[PDB]
Amino acid sequence: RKPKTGILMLNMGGPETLGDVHDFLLRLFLDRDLMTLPIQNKLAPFIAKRRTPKIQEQYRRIGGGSPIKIWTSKQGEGMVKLLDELSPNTAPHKYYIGFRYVHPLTEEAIEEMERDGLERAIAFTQYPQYSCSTTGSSLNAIYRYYNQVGRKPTMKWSTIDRWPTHHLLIQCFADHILKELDHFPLEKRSEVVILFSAHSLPMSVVNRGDPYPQEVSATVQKVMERLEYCNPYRLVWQSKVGPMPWLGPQTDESIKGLCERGRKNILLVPIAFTSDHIETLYELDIEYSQVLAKECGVENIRRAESLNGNPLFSKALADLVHSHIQSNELCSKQLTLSCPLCVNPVCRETKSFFTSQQL
Amino acid sequence: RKPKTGILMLNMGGPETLGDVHDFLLRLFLDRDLMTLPIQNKLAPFIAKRRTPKIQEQYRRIGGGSPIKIWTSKQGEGMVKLLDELSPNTAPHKYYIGFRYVHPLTEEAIEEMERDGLERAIAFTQYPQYSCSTTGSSLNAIYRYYNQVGRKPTMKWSTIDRWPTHHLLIQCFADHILKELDHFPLEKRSEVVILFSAHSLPMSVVNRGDPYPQEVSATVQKVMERLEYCNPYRLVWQSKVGPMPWLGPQTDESIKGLCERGRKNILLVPIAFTSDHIETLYELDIEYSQVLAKECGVENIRRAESLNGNPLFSKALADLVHSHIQSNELCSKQLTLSCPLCVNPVCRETKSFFTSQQL
Ligand code: HEM
Ligand code: HEM
Ligand SMILES: C[C@H](CCC(=O)O)[C@H]1CC[C@H]2[C@@H]3[C@H](O)C[C@@H]4C[C@H](O)CC[C@]4(C)[C@H]3C[C@H](O)[C@]12C
Ligand SMILES: C[C@H](CCC(=O)O)[C@H]1CC[C@H]2[C@@H]3[C@H](O)C[C@@H]4C[C@H](O)CC[C@]4(C)[C@H]3C[C@H](O)[C@]12C
Ligand SMILES: C[C@H](CCC(=O)O)[C@H]1CC[C@H]2[C@@H]3[C@H](O)C[C@@H]4C[C@H](O)CC[C@]4(C)[C@H]3C[C@H](O)[C@]12C
Ligand SMILES: C[C@H](CCC(=O)O)[C@H]1CC[C@H]2[C@@H]3[C@H](O)C[C@@H]4C[C@H](O)CC[C@]4(C)[C@H]3C[C@H](O)[C@]12C
Ligand code: FES
Ligand code: FES
Numbered sequence: 001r002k003p004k005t006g007i008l009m010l011n012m013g014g015p016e017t018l019g020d021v022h023d024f025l026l027r028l029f030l031d032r033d034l035m036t037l038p039i040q041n042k043l044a045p046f047i048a049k050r051r052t053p054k055i056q057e058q059y060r061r062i063g064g065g066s067p068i069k070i071w072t073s074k075q076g077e078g079m080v081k082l083l084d085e086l087s088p089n090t091a092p093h094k095y096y097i098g099f100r101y102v103h104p105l106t107e108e109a110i111e112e113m114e115r116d117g118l119e120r121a122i123a124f125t126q127y128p129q130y131s132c133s134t135t136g137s138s139l140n141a142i143y144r145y146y147n148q149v150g151r152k153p154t155m156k157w158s159t160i161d162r163w164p165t166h167h168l169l170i171q172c173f174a175d176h177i178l179k180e181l182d183h184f185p186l187e188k189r190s191e192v193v194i195l196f197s198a199h200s201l202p203m204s205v206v207n208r209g210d211p212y213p214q215e216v217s218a219t220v221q222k223v224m225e226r227l228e229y230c231n232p233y234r235l236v237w238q239s240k241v242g243p244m245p246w247l248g249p250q251t252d253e254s255i256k257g258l259c260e261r262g263r264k265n266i267l268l269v270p271i272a273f274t275s276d277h278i279e280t281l282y283e284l285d286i287e288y289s290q291v292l293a294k295e296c297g298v299e300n301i302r303r304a305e306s307l308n309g310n311p312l313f314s315k316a317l318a319d320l321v322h323s324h325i326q327s328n329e330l331c332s333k334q335l336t337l338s339c340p341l342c343v344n345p346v347c348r349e350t351k352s353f354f355t356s357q358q359l
Numbered sequence: 360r361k362p363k364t365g366i367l368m369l370n371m372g373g374p375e376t377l378g379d380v381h382d383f384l385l386r387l388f389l390d391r392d393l394m395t396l397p398i399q400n401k402l403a404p405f406i407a408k409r410r411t412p413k414i415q416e417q418y419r420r421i422g423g424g425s426p427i428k429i430w431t432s433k434q435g436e437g438m439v440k441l442l443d444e445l446s447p448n449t450a451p452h453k454y455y456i457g458f459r460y461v462h463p464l465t466e467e468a469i470e471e472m473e474r475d476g477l478e479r480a481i482a483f484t485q486y487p488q489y490s491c492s493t494t495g496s497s498l499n500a501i502y503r504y505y506n507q508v509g510r511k512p513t514m515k516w517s518t519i520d521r522w523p524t525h526h527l528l529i530q531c532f533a534d535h536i537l538k539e540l541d542h543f544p545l546e547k548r549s550e551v552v553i554l555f556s557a558h559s560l561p562m563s564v565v566n567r568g569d570p571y572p573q574e575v576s577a578t579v580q581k582v583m584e585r586l587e588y589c590n591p592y593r594l595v596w597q598s599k600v601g602p603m604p605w606l607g608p609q610t611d612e613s614i615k616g617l618c619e620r621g622r623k624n625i626l627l628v629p630i631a632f633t634s635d636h637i638e639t640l641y642e643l644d645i646e647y648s649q650v651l652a653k654e655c656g657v658e659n660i661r662r663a664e665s666l667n668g669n670p671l672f673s674k675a676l677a678d679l680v681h682s683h684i685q686s687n688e689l690c691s692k693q694l695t696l697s698c699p700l701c702v703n704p705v706c707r708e709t710k711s712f713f714t715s716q717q718l
Contacts, residue, residue: 165580193696203562207607209616214594217576221524232696235573245604248566254699257568261697337552337591338620340613 003094006118006155007083007321008109009076010138011126013099014066014275018056020102025051027101033137033344058278068275071308072097072126078314079321086322090120093321098123098138106141114154121155122321123354128169129198129219129272130162130332131212132339133205136347139335143350157357158330160320164215165222168316172307173219173269174226180267180304181231188299192231192265193258195251196220197280198272200237203245209339213247216272223271235271238280252281259296266301274307330354362453365477365514366442366680367468368435369497370485372458373425373636377418379461381411386460392496392703417637427634430667431456431485437673438680445681449479452680457482457497465500466507473513481680482518482713485667487528488557488578488631489521489691490571491698492564495706498694502709516716517689519679523574524581527675531666532578533585536628539663540590543624547658551590551624552617554610555579556639557631559596562604568698572606575631582630594630597639611640614660618651623658633666689713 015024028034029044037043059065076095083093094116098109113121123142125135139159146153163169177194184192198216206213220235236254240246249257255266270277282289282301292298307313331354338347374383387393388403396402418424435454442452453475457468472480482501484494498518505512522528536553543551557575565572579594595613599605608616614625629636641648641660651657666672690713697706 165584203604203607207609209593209595209608209613211593213572214576214579217573218580220573221577221580225524229692232692234568234570234696234699236568236699245562248562249568249699250566254568257699257701261699261701263696333588333591337593337622340593340595340608340616340620342616342620 001092003092003116003118005083005090005093005120005122005325006113006116007076007079007093007095007122007124008098008106008113009072009095009124009126010098010106010135011068011072011100012134012138013102014068014277015059015102016069017065018059020065021056021059022048022052024101025055031100031137033140033346034133061284062276062278066275066277068099069097071275071306074309075314075317078311079317082315082318083321086318087325090325094118100138100141106138107145110142110145118155121153121157122324123157123159123161124317124321125159125161126274127272128162128166128274129164129212129215130334131201131205131210132342132344132347133201133210134212135161136350139354140344140346140350143346143353146353147349156359157354158324158359159335159354160324161332161335162211162215163320164219166316166320168312168319170219170222170226172310172313172316173223173271173304175312176304176307176310177223177227177267177269180302183302184265184267184300188265190231192267192300193263194224194231194233194267194269195254195258196223196233196235196269196271197238197251198235200240200246200248200250203247206247208341208343211334211339212272219271231267239278255280255282255301256292259292259298262296264297264299266298268301268303270304270306274313276306276308279303328359330357330359360451362451362475363478364442364449364452365472365475365480366435366438366452366454367457367465367472367480367482367501368431368454368485369457369465369482369494370427370431370459370634371493371497372461373427373634374418374461375428376424377415379424380415380418381407383460384410384414390459390496392499392705393492420643421635421638425634425636427458427667428456428461430634430665434667434673434676437670438676441674441677442680445677446684449684453477459497459500465497466504469501469504477514480512480514480516481683482516482520483676483680484518484520485633486631487521487525487633488523488571488574489693490560490564491569491701491703491706492560493571494520495709498713499705499709502712503705505712506708515718516713517683518694518713519683520691520694521570521574522679523578525675525679527671527678528666529578529581529585531669531672531675532582532628532630532663534669534671535663535666536582536586536626539626539661542661543626543659547624549590551626551659552622553583553590553592553626553628554613554617555582555592555594555628555630556597556610557594559599559605559607559609562606565606567700567702570693570698571631578630590626598637614639614641615651618655618657621655623656625657625660627660627662629663629665633672635665638662687718689716689718
């Protein structure tokens with residue numbers, strides 16, 4: 001059969017090889033849903049060119065690019081196999097990858113879904129916790145697509161716009177933490193600090209009402225509850241860019257501080273981005289990790305595995321899509337409230353786009 | 360019988376009448392566990408003297424003082440009566456009030472407990488979510504008292520140092536939200552924004568690793584889960600004092616922004632302090648509330664009733680202490696980990712005090 005139900009898997013994407021870095025950065029610095037700059041169209045190319053070498057080097061340090069496309073396909077394949085059996089009524093299901101900044105682009109994916117003549121189309125964010133900078137931008141792209149092409153959808157749209165506490169998602173994290181705890185010496189396991197490390201946001205964005213920090217905090221609590229509070233934890237924030245204030249404590253400064261304070265065993269947990277991504281200073285820079293161990297005698301810094309290809313993760317994705325279908329919901333209740341200090345007029349347009357959809 | 364088990368209920372306290380404001384402020388500005396000032400012993404009295412009139416005026420706007428002692432007593436009474444039934448092996452139970460900044464002071468309470476010759480003493484924070492500034496300060500006072508008087512406890516100590524997701528607590532919040540929602544016109548009820556408002560922290564304290572924002576966020580998610588996400592929400596942060604950066608969005612600014620963006624019905628929820636306390640600008644200031652209703656036509660701003668009161672709240676407190684007793688725990692796993700950037704040497708001492716206790 002032709003596909004009946006399209007599942008658009010939304011994420012920012014990542015450069016597949018170091019050659020893909022420039023254009024990735026270009027599209028990112030051009031995203032007005034992410035950031036607004038003066039003379040943006042002139043400034044984005046310059047910033048992209050300027051930061052390309054730094055970012056290529058970071059991707060090189062993690063194997064030569066981002067594996068997001070391959071992992072997202074794997075998960076999409078596994079999700080679709082389960083849905084076809086879970087929801088025969090909406091079968092056949094087809095997943096589509098819609099990346100914000102690399103091919104296949106959100107717009108290229110919408111264009112294919114439309115030509116496929118689907119009956120139903122689900123904007124399924126791959127960020128469990130909603131930020132306007134992440135899911136918001138991806139959702140805004142869907143609206144901006146139809147508005148640029150000056151026409152209306154031929155498919156029935158809905159969105160799964162957040163899922164920070166999904167039970168199978170929580171189960172996956174708790175499982176990966178336990179597996180990584182096993183790699184610490186038995187005599188030290190109970191002493192390990194679990195540092196949940198999510199990507200930071202600028203304080204300007206936190207202060208305008210972005211939902212992300214509170215949702216990330218919920219995921220953390222649910223994971224520790226599942227783990228029966230077996231170890232001590234903190235939620236800290238990684239990878240802040242530039243000189244402006246961002247939400248802290250910063251992951252790097254917290255690893256250093258913890259080691260200076262006698263905590264020699266640290267387990268980093270990627271709580272807010274489900275694929276392998278760029279690592280932190282103490283994980284990557286050997287000059288820095290050398291100094292740390294000399295001064296404070298750090299014993300073990302380890303990072304839990306990314307949800308990547310874990311099949312209980314595909315079960316999570318299918319469970320979410322299946323529940324969404326059964327519920328007949330068009331979006332979360334949370335999507336219907338914009339940030340108290342939102343200054344982007346596209347946000348409410350995108351909201352109405354979803355809440356107003358046929359069905 | 361003579362009392363067997365003491366439950367020291369810890370909170371900052373509040374001035375019972377307007378004449379109690381100066382000494383309340385004095386002890387607050389003197390608290391090195393709360394804030395660090397140069398020449399603190401000299402500066403605190405001056406600050407306390409200078410801010411007394413403004414804080415008196417704020418307490419006048421809410422009826423002439425804080426009801427915290429009366430509410431804490433009532434809950435203490437209810438708690439104990441349930442505990443005598445719940446845990447006959449530790450009966451009779453006796454509650455003690457230990458306020459940080461007003462009588463009865465933490466130290467006065469410790470002294471009475473020792474005189475009563477209790478077998479067991481439980482340091483039971485009345486802040487559900489842990490901050491170094493609140494629970495941390497109250498706990499450091501317990502260690503600082505024995506270190507001051509140069510001797511050791513004659514009672515077996517433990518602590519219930521946080522409880523941000525206790526099921527009965529969550530049930531109380533959800534009940535009080537529903538009750539308050541009933542006061543909005545039924546045609547408008549589903550549109551009302553639930554604005555959870557917790558007291559803010561300075562960014563310097565957030566950035567050093569304070570556990571509070573993540574724990575408050577957890578309370579919020581558990582409440583919204585129980586409410587089945589019936590209304591849209593944001594967690595915002597109130598009462599920020601002075602010029603320095605504090606964690607936002609700020610409650611006042613978010614109320615203004617929401618109304619300017621078409622949200623005319625708002626329900627404020629005191630999610631992190633369980634007694635009546637000083638209210639916000641749009642609740643207290645007639646000039647401001649008028650400007651707002653005129654410029655963007657705000658229709659209803661209501662505040663959910665404070666918990667300290669409700670018998671399911673007493674039932675929550677007793678359930679906590681009973682579970683604590685059954686568990687044999689000396690403190691949470693979380694207390695065993697200090698802030699990654701803690702610069703207060705007393706924090707580790709206090710931690711050791713509890714984890715090292717006999718039994
Ligand atoms: C307003 C908020 C944000 C801004 C301004 C921002 C900024 C940036 C910038 C400039 C880059 C390119 C690398 C560089 O030039 O240094 C980047 C990459 C990235 N960002 Fe963000 N970001 C934001 C929010 C987020 C959130 C909320 C997440 C995760 C859920 C996230 C995840 C990523 C990832 C995965 C990369 C790719 C490189 C890596 O693996 O770290 N970002 N971001
Ligand atoms: C380092 C963090 C904190 C600082 C520096 C701070 C500062 C202050 C100061 C100076 C006052 C006296 C009133 C004034 O002079 O304006 C005050 C009162 C108060 N604070 Fe905090 N505070 C902090 C954290 C917290 C937290 C986490 C909570 C709640 C859990 C809280 C709840 C209160 C309450 C209830 C009052 C009494 C007056 C009122 O009802 O607002 N504070 N605080
Ligand atoms: C002033 C502005 C702040 C953004 C805003 O208006 O809100 C900032 C944001 C990004 C900045 C630019 C980027 O950091 C890239 C350049 C970096 C150089 O150090 C200065 C010029 C440079 C071209 C910057 C000029 C200026 O400080 C910019 C344009
Ligand atoms: C980190 C990068 C620096 C570019 C460079 O100097 O090479 C700059 C370029 C554009 C900047 C952003 C834009 O100035 C818009 C935002 C302005 C806010 O004051 C801080 C976050 C904010 C989202 C900025 C964060 C950061 O400083 C960015 C992302
Ligand atoms: C010197 C020190 C700066 C270093 C620090 O951040 O601790 C700061 C922290 C608290 C400050 C004081 C407090 O802010 C209270 C006072 C407020 C007055 O309006 C200015 C001076 C005032 C008397 C301040 C002087 C000085 O800047 C102090 C003493
Ligand atoms: C409350 C009062 C603000 C007076 C005012 O309304 O301007 C002042 C006096 C002591 C101050 C505190 C002290 O300066 C110590 C802390 C220093 C940090 O850099 C900011 C928060 C910090 C905790 C301060 C916040 C705020 O400026 C305080 C709390
Ligand atoms: S920026 Fe959050 S809704 Fe627009
Ligand atoms: S300041 Fe948090 S542990 Fe000392």
